[PDB]
Subunit: 427 residues, 4 copies
């Protein structure tokens, strides 16, 4: 037939696992032959998933740390890279609130269709590709890498291990670079800073992490796998079967049949250590922005897994000035990086930037009409010194690029967009 997409042999995969330092501390409870048996006759190449994953892994070891902001539209991701950020965080919370495939506004409880986050991954890459295409024809070299890696939210898997497997597969097809997975009961998933959280036994989350790795292996991409634990605040567990969880089981039971468990940094350390061999980065949800507790978690984990990188949630669910002074806020991220928190991200940055900017505009617009918008347009003009370009909105969305396509197909076409527009004649 054709040699396109021929699967590699179990020997090559074993070779790659043995020699490539990317897999230096990755445990696999399945064999390389098990991967081959699940790949059929053709293995689709996932370019953006591979490139982003390799770029992400590289940046986590080159840069002091990799920091990101939550993005829920393609334009958001474009502006984050344009501004200098090297990675995009794809928040599930935000998807639930304003960008999921049901069309409804949801709280962060795994209510939306399971393929919603993959579509936002694809959408973001599409927008970054368009920005990359525009920069090439415009000769704009302000950004070295427009295809910045995407770290996406796997939540609690939307079911069992097969649901996990299919979500990770869908995230890779969309071109994700990393995905994170939490140890909550899928049917009761909550945001890390909401209540009513229900843990699942330690082994079950290792099962989830193993499933996430397996799909990345079957698709043949070094996807960064992130493990999140919600044990600092969760006081409910589904079962006491796992002996690793028993020291925190109180015996008390709820009407639903859940077991009460003792929460805090100790069960997070215990679970972190158990997840480490199956996680490229570890992440513990916390109740406050507190450097001491972060250092404490960092020390206990690195005392057994010294090279284990960590991720920290700089959550807008914290009232930041209520806990930290301005000076502590200024060094918060830099001090975290010294502890090994190499991926840091403001999860709901997109939500609050979108909701506040439109309220501020609409409120002024209701009182003073055009005066309020001219205020915004002038800030846009003033920001052009800093590299802002979306003021010329026609080229920002690719008017020049499609004019180039149109002239490539027909050099004498008289229906090009940017020639004659008010943009070229007023900006």
């Amino acid at each position: 037939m054709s040699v396109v997409g021929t699967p590699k042999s179990a020997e090559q995969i074993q070779q790659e696992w043995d020699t490539n330092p990317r897999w230096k501390d990755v445990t696999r409870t399945y064999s390389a032959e098990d991967v081959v048996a699940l790949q059929g006759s053709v293995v689709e190449e996932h370019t953006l998933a591979r490139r982003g994953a390799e770029v992400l892994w590289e940046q986590l070891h080159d840069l002091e740390w990799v920091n990101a902001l939550g993005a829920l539209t393609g334009n958001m991701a474009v502006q984050q890279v344009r501004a200098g950020l090297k990675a995009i965080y794809l928040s599930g919370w935000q998807v639930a609130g304003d960008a999921n495939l049901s069309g409804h506004t949801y709280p962060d409880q795994s209510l939306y269709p399971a393929n919603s986050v993959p579509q936002v991954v694809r959408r973001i890459n599409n927008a970054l590709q368009r920005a990359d295409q525009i920069a090439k024809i415009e000769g704009d070299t302000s950004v070295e890498n427009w295809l910045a890696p995407i770290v996406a939210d796997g939540e609690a898997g939307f079911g069992g291990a097969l649901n996990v497997y299919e979500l990770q597969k869908a995230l890779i097809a969309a071109g994700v670079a990393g995905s994170h997975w939490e140890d909550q009961l899928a049917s009761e998933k909550k945001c890390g800073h909401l209540g009513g959280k229900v843990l699942i036994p330690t082994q079950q989350h290792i099962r989830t992490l193993t499933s996430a790795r397996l799909a990345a292996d079957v698709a043949d991409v070094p996807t960064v796998v992130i493990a999140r634990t919600d044990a600092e605040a969760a006081t409910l567990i589904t079962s006491d079967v796992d002996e690793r969880d028993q020291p925190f089981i109180t015996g008390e039971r709820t009407r639903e049949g859940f077991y009460r468990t003792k929460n805090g940094i100790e069960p997070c350390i215990a679970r972190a250590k158990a997840y480490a061999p199956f996680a490229d980065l570890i992440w513990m949800e916390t109740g406050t922005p507190d450097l001491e507790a972060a250092r404490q978690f960092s020390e206990a984990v690195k005392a057994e897994y010294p090279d284990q990188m960590l991720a920290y949630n700089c959550s807008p669910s914290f009232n930041w000035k209520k806990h930290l002074d301005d000076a502590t806020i200024a060094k918060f991220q830099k001090e975290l990086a010294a502890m090994g928190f190499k991926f840091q991200f403001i999860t709901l940055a997109g939500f609050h930037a979108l909701n506040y900017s439109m309220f501020d505009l609409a409120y002024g617009y209701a009182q003073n009409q055009m005066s309020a918008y001219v205020e915004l347009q002038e800030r846009e003009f003033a920001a052009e010194e800093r590299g802002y370009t979306a003021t010329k909105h026609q080229r920002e969305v690719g008017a020049g690029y499609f004019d180039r396509i149109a002239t490539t197909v027909d050099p004498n076409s008289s229906t090009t967009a940017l020639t004659g527009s008010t943009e070229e004649g007023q900006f």
Copy 2:
């Protein structure tokens, strides 16, 4: 027997409504009431939000000094606009093309995206307003009397022929649109009004479009507001010279494609506006500058033949406002326009610029000072609570308390509610 739910009206009932309801006092239909019924089948679905929105919109356009709106490309965007006191929502096709269409790609405004993209955003905006209305009910919030603000959505050029026009209107009505606007451009060469290289369609062809949009609203039995837009002020090309109303502006020369070169300006806009009036609840003239004098010329000339005709005006971000106008004129702009008959006024790309600038300003500061940049935003949100802002408590803004209410309604003793013990409960 058989269920009578959704039994269609008779032809005589429709004719009585057309004859006596003042909504249709100036609406011309070249088809009959029996034609409408003939297309409705055995069951006519109710479109609650499209009906409510259309009625509220029409009432507001006659009761308020003028209705104004801002472009919205996400559900949360519309929530804040209504929360801030706005009484209508404009759904830009430009914004949908650039950051919210079903292809997943970023497109310029050239009718490149799938034809059902805007309807999806109509349904999304309504869903988001319904969630804010639900939350408001359980929170005792009465700061907004009508959360379900009318939506005016961009129908562009119909994505093809009359049948493409019809299905787009039907899909917008099914999603709950209050009004839709249609422009006299060649769909295969559609452009934003302030882009170059526009190709007009013949006047009679856009009367076909407006007639098809009205027909789709009638078959669906909702009084959708039909808005006619003309791009004749800047377009120098037209597909054909077949319409005698267009011929006086044609020069005679043709392009290699076969298009006819035509003379643009306000004069062909007035002519097309007069021809569209019997089929348009609102008329909209795309212009190259924000000019009150030019707006008055178009208004007086149109109202001379149809004095009750309402107009619409695009306060376009494509205009460099302070380059053309002083601050005093900017402050009175919409007010002066309202006196001329421009009763619906909108900023098309308000959402694109608010979204792109806010995220850039945050990411720029975040790239240099990390958390110090975000705390500034959070502190601004805290400060905006005096003006009525609420999204700082993001958990309840998206309905965590509402779904907690659903959960406890099913199981009052559930121990897995979301807001209970949340960091929002204890820190905000």
Copy 3:
């Protein structure tokens, strides 16, 4: 500012519950005031959900029984109604296999996105509507009701109570007439005739049926709620918390923490008795198609609730010529109806009809090329005297209907479809 979609008061709802015989045997653990508190300021009308639910409830008490076939495309439902069936069944198995929003082929384990089945409900209603429209312009009264009630698969709700609520809401928005919900763990969901099934406690499914009724009440439509139990084959359960399930707990455990339980018709009778106050119909999956086993379940349930209607799956997963003789197969549904099984359905009928007919045609096409297809078309021609109409495929999908729209907008259009078509000149 309008009164469209104004919610009813709690007293009005409570009065409907107290007097409308539709709710005669319906237990609601929540209050009428709870329903109102969740409805915001506007309640959208769900015309097809209301009509379908009403028609369904009417047919279950007026006809000897209501039989259906699984359909996964719009055209399938059209042909089912065309051939004389009064109800459509929407299999979740079939959606997982060949019609879900992931684009992938899935076994029946709740792997596809949760809004997949609603989309097919909307699709089926859309296709039935088109046939209804086509029949009107064609003067075809051979079918009384093209909008046959749809009974859709809710699986295990795709999570907790709130996931159940949203699926029911979406099914209603899409126009479903009824939905069935099973007492399996959504995380490890399986087809009823698959292995490794894990039950949830009796009370957790009572909570599911409650959330399902609540979503219908908030939507103000009398959706037929069906309760399904898988305890006939399942040897696992998630917890021993419910004392109604404890008499079957063996005391063993699994590595995952599941509890071994004793399967059989006995725990199905018990769970059905518990589910009865919360189900318009009750259904137990069974390992074989057996009339006596069905009579045992029937008479046992009706011993406590003699007016409880039941549902039965004549599963394709069975092997009928193996078990039963021809004469028993003929009387099978008729005898099941006399026992109270008033809704019967063949789940995977669409899957098998689609896969076999395409294999049969593709195989013949491989050997004999055009000779194979001509056998089908002549078989299609022959079926016209039984009512079949899809041989003329252009009119079947609405070519004439859209000609009517096109001629209504522009009666002089020179670009209509059926005039000059090969269908017009070659199909008499």
Copy 4:
């Protein structure tokens, strides 16, 4: 700062056009530098679009003729390959009637959303991949290539060249092997065998074919481009600007501004010769299944382009036994293959198979209930001799394959699907 997805140089592309025999008779009015200019920094790999396009082109030259059937669902395509067919045809007609993203039933008039056919391409490929995966774990080698190439319907492009460009790009992203494009006015597009067809000028369709090729080159895949002409029955054209069309323009006009034109085989031959340098296959819609009329079209085109391959629509819109005897019906495809019609397809085969088979069952079901179904189940049993496998429906949709994924993740899983089922016990 990675190498994955690096675009190749213009001279590297120019070398493929000059040497690869795939492009021996392909005219490109744009340059290799033009292609590189539109590719940005990264070029995604479209494995299935590449593999399928290479397989299809190879089959067209190696087989007597490649024939296919219309498929509108994933399971349909699975059964077509299972029965021995080596290609899938994706009818736009069928998509409009029962599988487009609007949810509505439509006549064949370009009414549905433009990304609908790409979705079905991706869906068909997903189904074929699932059958490929199941076949691997079951040791099934009765099918050599489950990834049969897909020929998809691009209709009239849903607008201008930029619309054409985006449809071809989305089809390629979905894994298409070929796409066909017709010379109709998009806003008035009709099925070839419906009335009221309006042609666009010859040059405008060359513009379409060029745009379709450009998108395939920018995607770096050898997509098979097929040119369809509707001039046999269409008596309308939009303009008289192209002098190649004027010898058929009569001077008559319609109220809309169209031009009456003389339909027939003559303008089909002329337009075909104009499309030949821009089309890998050429396709003339006809009003009857006539072998003599096909020869005239074939020998006329091949007089100027000897190696020009042709495609023929064996349309269900023909009443076959009203025109042909059984002897001619049997040899129809074979005769066409000898004239150079190397891609032959029954467009609406899926619609009629699905609609008839369900009416036949539902009718008998409404009359004799279970007896009607057991007849179908018995015919499915008897079909196992011929290779039919969907009778065991659980494994048919991958229950066994996902059981493998489950046991690969956790060997001791108590929640496997096929063990203890009625499939392993009654089949």
